[PDB]
């Protein structure tokens, strides 16, 4: 079985870069709308005994992409493809996992019964926003990671990283912080709301970093640099692998005192880009690159959770 | 267990006929969007325990209306309602019930593993376009049937209705014609496209009228209605249980020799009624409704095949 | 994996057939019955870690067969073969796709089950009545058409076949006629029944081919014959994927006005081809043998949808 | 809901016998045979929100019986029944419960898991071969013994059954007959094969009743009751729950020194019983209709195991 | 249906009182060990049709009880009870809901897994270490809160608890600890550990008060009390639902700081509590025995979220 | 696809001897338990793309060794191992393998549908209590016998084997010595209780060979050992595949009159054989080799059912 690499509508150019960094075109797939506005699919070349990758990221119009995928799995698992994986940057529905005191859906089991029932046999996605979502699915779910990606910023970046402070916006994610101190060596300073803020750790004089793995309506990191400015910190910067950057977040964004916002490119860019100057974006094409390869290959893959391929 | 009637987005006026048919109020639920547009959905009443059934046609934003549909569907299921039956007036995907030459997905065998892995116990619909659909699910599925409905329409509105012709616009659907016609005792006139069309079955100087299962683009039944009008017929009446009108639909039948364009309201109708004067509008809430109740009380659905209730 | 070909007892001839086109001999099977009629199944080789292909038309004494190969599947499956294939020319139970009024069930669905949960990973057949089937289950399914034998055969014997006519007996197949006549670049007439049959297409003084999927009593091909024969067609012809032949058939053949009734050989044609002259058969084994090839080794089964091998 | 009871086409008495016992009906279903002799089933009546109990038997034409069997489980199950039980009082291929060392299939798991997808609720058989059949379900499976019914025949027409012996056949299944022993307070004296017999348990001038679930070719009890007869014991006796007596049965039965051969009517009689005259039938109608019954009030099945009602 | 409670060997008084509390005798079950310390289970009473529920506890040797469940449900399941509940106080493997970086099982998934193939239909546990196993099931899961019982005890125990403190020992619980803060109206000090602890919020001459999940080991409260002794607090107590207690923690309770130690009766404590004086115990089986009445009626479960019964 | 050899806790030294027969390193994995007895299991190394085995029985702490077995399944599974097989000598809950009149759990039924839910694709086991538990299982079950490792002791550790006699201890295995006594060419005298034992079969002056799948109480074998040596045997042997030797086992081997008492090494015996002098045991080491190497390469694994490697 070979690879074949297959783009949804959602995501286009990360799907190219994957495909470029394995020396392989995407395969041939028309991927429209019928006039009343349901998925067209039709997949342009055989996959019969093929390592099918569908690449498609939970961004944009998510119902559409999301529909698209499923559509796209069942016809590559109809046509007798060997194996088909969904590489699914940022997963959609994925803050919807639990309940917690509503009558309200768990979406993000829903999604991911939805994909095994399309047929997806394995799924690649990058910094869930819960890791318990991989306890969602029966099949193989790879959760991948951007840190040795923000990590390699930083330090080619922000030029008294030695000195820095990593400080977490909300209590729940302190343990990405926590492992990113960790290997740089520095301070975690934390953030906490009660309108107000709770700081702990030396800001003061320094460089702040807000680390996260989202921004949807950029709410939550600029009320966490609005504290951590209060407290005297020389810059502050934030970091986060999926830039949703919905609503408001572009004015806000715009409004705040970040020296810069840094996004991974899970989710296009370019159109956001256009309206603020002070977004930047880390490529983690390479990552997913080198997971799909070696998933391919049968070679370990959380050999990426601390090296730069 | 009482009967919960719930609304999705997609036909709230068609849920609200049902709900006052049956004597009930709708169930509170909120159905909206988050900022990135992820959908939300809350269920603002205890179902444990209920019979659960909500309604929400395929039209519209179609991927957006079937997540809603799946989502509320895992809600309702995980707090613990009875039993939960997907009200579909008209199926989404129905049309790609088949391969056929094409590695093409089947879309509505992909829907109908997602209906039963969210948690639908039973399936209602309507007019299915193809009743091998029912196939494609391991739990019941009623399709209900507009024919009576279109009956009393034609004896009702059509002055000349034991002299009209009963016309097939595809050689696919005639099976529909020539019950109609066998209920009204009436010939069935067929048309077929060899750009050009072939119709048998004297039309000159009666009424024709086409009854197809849905008019999208309406390029099927605007071929069929100019095939006829060569043919001598004095007026031409097109009748579907549903309207989906996309596209160009409402132009061509403006410009077309209709003299009525029948529709059920298994999809709203009134914006496309503004835009086009010989719209019609059959009203089947009540063929619903009674489906629903049946169902409920144990009483036979199939009486419902043949009489208006 | 190598392939292996076992053959139920239905058609034992046509799997010898694939089995020399692929340089196989047949495995070794007992398959006999009990004393009490209960089906008996021995696989006399291992089949460990081996691609496995099952040969059993749907016919003769069917729920045996059925049975037969239901059973077969399963000693295979059990057996740790590496992947079992159901190779099923004439698929049972075809004809009862869908309930459409009646309380009545869809056997074809209950019959892909039965081969889903006995352990089939892949079924191949051949011109099934609704290729909705193909969604009835949920493992990738092959259906092949007979249509390239059919069309050099039509080529190979019969001499005015650039002026004949390809004729669909009733409404419901005539996809399969306009796919030959566009093939063949001819006229596809066509018939229906209204006691009368009306046609619409010139056949006088023409050779009128019906194309069918299958002739069970022949009451279809030989009431479209009759029809053909009122308007003038110096010769009828009759073509057919399946000729099954059952009750009264044979009689009605002999009676009738065929030129020539081709069938194909998915189901055994001997015994009626002693009783009725004008019965020919064309040989699919090819077909099915590169149908099965092209599986095992991952190249393009489509292809075998427009080219004769 | 109420009881609702179907025959297939099997049993058609002993399901009268179960109906009348119940005060009901046999429900409205058209069983008989296309053209083709493939099934055709038809529910004549409403079953929606009903209790559906299907009686047949695996007897006679095994094959076509369990596939109509299946096909009524379907249909009743697709129109909304809200419970379906097969009621089977003879499991088909019970007898093929493993594999051993052959490489065979286990047809009883796979008539199981037919069952189960067919979309029965609950089993309920009579004298499983083995009643480890019952974890091929993961159904509940209600297995009915003819203990009782035997223990009342045997004191009502063995004059000397205080001192009789209860003797197996074969070693396998001796439980039934020291089940058996212990309620009359009798020896249970056994007999296995070396083509020589043994047996432990003095027979000499007295009855001898060999006890076995089924009797297919009688092999197995003509063998036993040759050895008896050796033995010295004045008469020998045979009874039995399946009598199946397919083959060369009824001449061994007729050749051999059997006072009679008792069997239950699980299987129906009539016409070996006309070829036969120490045929003698033991109604167990009574124990089905109570099970029917006390499963559908959520009554004690297992009361029945030591009563007869 | 009749509410029929059987309890497991793990927590036989809690079952006692949620019995009591319903009006209810314990169901007859044997629940031991043969000879080779398989579990042996017998069912002493017919459930046929009943709602059956199950209670057990993670606690003591977890993997014999977690067992014990598992084989209760599959024999009540399978002698057709109607609805089968595993009622978990303390649900086990609940730890080891997530991979995050190791080469490790998702254990709460597997035994989500178990408990849903053995048959259980429904789930009731109390405070589960993460909400998201919710999603770990396709059963409904009502997941009970001690947060009603916990205010109750602090507004019943504590003079100064209008000015105390509740205080998270981990940054991940601190949910729990905003949602207990805002329902007393009381400020939420946050503790977490850089061997060194950083604490916000003024603790100084008040009463401090721990709220967690569970105390396995106590080594997060003993660690987190010695910070908050470090700055001043009169008093401090520690409030969890779960007292599991193993290994060390006892002698570490002991020579800690605490007022009191207050844990739920979701595991026995009866054995600890006589080495560790400060213990003291919440009755919770009102909240249970309510939830076990509301699902058997169909009432409102999430009434319980905020209401003492 | 290489293979890699884990060993559960409960048989290192039988994992290790299958390991260096296949010229293997055993897997680096932890398998441990946290403070409060729960399982840990951790896989040192990846098991991405290989076919993993492994190595556990059902002997020691069964409930701890299952579910370890079940959690290490569950981790290779979710870590992307291609095949995972539970290499199962002695099959745990294999006696509860059915009801037969009790409000019951069918365990074993239980344990393969935990095994299979775990994600096992493949079982292999040795001398199953019951050959039906092979359908209790959807996957592949390699049920190997100990009988060509037994049939090579007795020839070659008891001098008269030729006049010996094989002797079965209940009714129930008698198939065993059958097939053994077949194979040596000598008698099969058989055992069974009326607290009195019944023998038939000359076993005076020779040598009588007990011949059981498992000896847990040796109550079983006990009585037999005395039935036989009233009737004169010169010596008495047992010889079993499972040597579990629970509760009061290894005194009545000591006051039993056992020539010797031989056991595979399914479970490990160093420590009743400290206790016991005339336990001899079996190495089956080879065989399970030769199985894991035979699955893995495609080669036939029945084979083994009659030669020793
Ligand atoms: N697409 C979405 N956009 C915005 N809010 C969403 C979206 N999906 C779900 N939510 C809601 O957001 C909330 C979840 O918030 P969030 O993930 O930030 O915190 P949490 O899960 O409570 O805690 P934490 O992640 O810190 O452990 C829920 O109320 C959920 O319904
Ligand atoms: N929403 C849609 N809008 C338009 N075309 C669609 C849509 N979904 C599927 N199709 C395409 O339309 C075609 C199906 O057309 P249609 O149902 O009219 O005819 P058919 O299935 O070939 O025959 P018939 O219904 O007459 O038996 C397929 O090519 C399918 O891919
Ligand atoms: N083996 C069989 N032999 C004869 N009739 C059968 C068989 N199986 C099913 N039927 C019945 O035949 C009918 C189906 O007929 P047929 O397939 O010719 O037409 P259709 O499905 O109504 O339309 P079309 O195939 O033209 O779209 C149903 O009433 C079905 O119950
Ligand atoms: N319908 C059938 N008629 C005859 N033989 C059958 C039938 N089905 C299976 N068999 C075969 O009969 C054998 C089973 O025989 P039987 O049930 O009498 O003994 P057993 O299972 O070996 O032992 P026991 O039942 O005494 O414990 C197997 O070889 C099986 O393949
Ligand atoms: N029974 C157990 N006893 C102790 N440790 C366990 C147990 N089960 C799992 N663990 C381990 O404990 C760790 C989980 O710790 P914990 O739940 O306290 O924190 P977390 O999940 O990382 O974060 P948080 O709960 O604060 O969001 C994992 O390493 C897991 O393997
Ligand atoms: N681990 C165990 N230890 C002891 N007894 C057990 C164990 N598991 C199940 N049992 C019980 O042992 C009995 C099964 O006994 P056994 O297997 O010896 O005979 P059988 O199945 O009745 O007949 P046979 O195996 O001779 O055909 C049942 O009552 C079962 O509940
Ligand atoms: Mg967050
Ligand atoms: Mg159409
Ligand atoms: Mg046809
Ligand atoms: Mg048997
Ligand atoms: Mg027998
Ligand atoms: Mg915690
Ligand atoms: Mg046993
Ligand atoms: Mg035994």
Same mark, same amino acid.
């Given at each position: 079985?070979?690879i074949? %690499?297959?783009?949804?509508?959602?995501?286009?150019?990360?799907s190219?870069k994957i495909?470029?960094?394995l020396?392989?075109?995407?395969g041939?797939?028309v991927?429209?709308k019928?006039?009343?506005?349901?998925?067209?699919?039709?997949?342009?070349?055989?996959? =019969?005994?093929?390592?099918?990758?569908?690449?498609?990221?939970?961004?944009? #119009?998510? @119902?559409?992409?999301?529909?698209?995928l499923?559509?796209?799995?069942?016809?590559?698992?109809?046509?007798?493809?060997? =194996?088909?994986? &969904?590489?699914?940057?940022c997963?959609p529905?994925? !803050?919807?996992?639990?309940?917690?005191?509503?009558?309200?859906?768990?979406?993000?089991?829903?999604?991911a019964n939805?994909?095994?029932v399309?047929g &997806?046999?394995?799924?690649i996605?990058?910094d869930? +926003?819960?890791?318990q979502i991989?306890?969602?699915?029966?099949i193989p779910?790879? @959760?991948?990671? $951007? #840190?040795?990606?923000?990590? *390699?910023?930083?330090?080619?970046?922000?030029?008294?990283?030695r @000195?820095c402070?990593?400080?977490?916006?909300? $209590?729940?994610? $302190?343990? !990405?912080?926590?492992?990113?101190?960790?290997?740089?060596?520095?301070?975690?300073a934390?953030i906490?709301?009660?309108d107000?803020?709770?700081?702990?750790?030396?800001?003061?004089?320094?460089?702040?970093?807000?680390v996260?793995?989202?921004a949807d309506?950029?709410?939550?990191?600029?009320? &966490? $640099?609005?504290?951590?400015?209060?407290?005297?910190?020389? =810059?502050?910067?934030?970091?986060?692998?999926?830039?949703?950057f919905?609503?408001?977040? %572009?004015?806000?964004?715009?409004n705040?005192?970040? #020296?810069?916002?840094?996004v991974?490119n899970?989710?296009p860019?370019?159109?956001?880009? *256009? +309206?603020?100057? *002070?977004?930047?974006? %880390?490529?983690?094409?390479?990552?997913?690159? #080198? &997971?799909? !390869?070696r998933?391919? @290959?049968?070679?370990?893959?959380?050999?990426?959770?601390? +090296?730069?391929?």
């Open positions: 079985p070979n074949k %690499i297959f783009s949804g509508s959602s995501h286009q150019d990360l190219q495909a470029d960094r020396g392989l075109e995407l041939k797939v991927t429209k019928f006039s009343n506005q349901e998925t067209c699919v039709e997949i342009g070349e055989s996959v =019969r005994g093929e390592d099918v990758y569908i690449v498609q990221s939970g961004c944009g #119009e998510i @119902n559409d992409n999301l529909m698209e499923l559509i796209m799995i069942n016809a590559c698992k109809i046509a007798s493809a060997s =194996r088909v994986t &969904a590489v699914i940057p997963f529905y994925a !803050r919807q996992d639990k309940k917690d005191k509503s009558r309200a859906p768990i979406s993000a089991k829903l999604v939805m994909l095994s399309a &997806a046999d394995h799924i996605t990058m869930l +926003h819960a890791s991989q306890g969602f699915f029966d779910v790879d @959760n991948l990671y $951007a #840190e040795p990606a923000v990590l *390699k910023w930083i330090r080619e970046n922000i030029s008294e990283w @000195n402070t990593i400080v977490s916006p909300d $209590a729940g994610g $302190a343990k !990405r912080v926590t492992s990113i101190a960790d290997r740089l060596n520095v301070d975690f934390l906490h709301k009660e107000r803020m709770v700081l702990v750790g030396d800001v003061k004089d320094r460089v702040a970093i807000l996260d793995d989202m309506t950029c709410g939550t990191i600029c009320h &966490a $640099a609005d504290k951590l400015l209060s407290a005297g910190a020389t =810059r502050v910067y934030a970091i986060l692998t999926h830039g949703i919905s609503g408001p977040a %572009i004015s806000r964004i715009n705040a005192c970040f #020296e810069a916002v840094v991974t899970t989710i860019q370019e159109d956001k880009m *256009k +309206h603020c100057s *002070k977004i930047q974006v %880390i490529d983690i094409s390479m990552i997913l690159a #080198e &997971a799909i !390869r998933t391919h @290959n049968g070679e370990s893959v959380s050999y990426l959770f601390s +090296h730069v391929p």
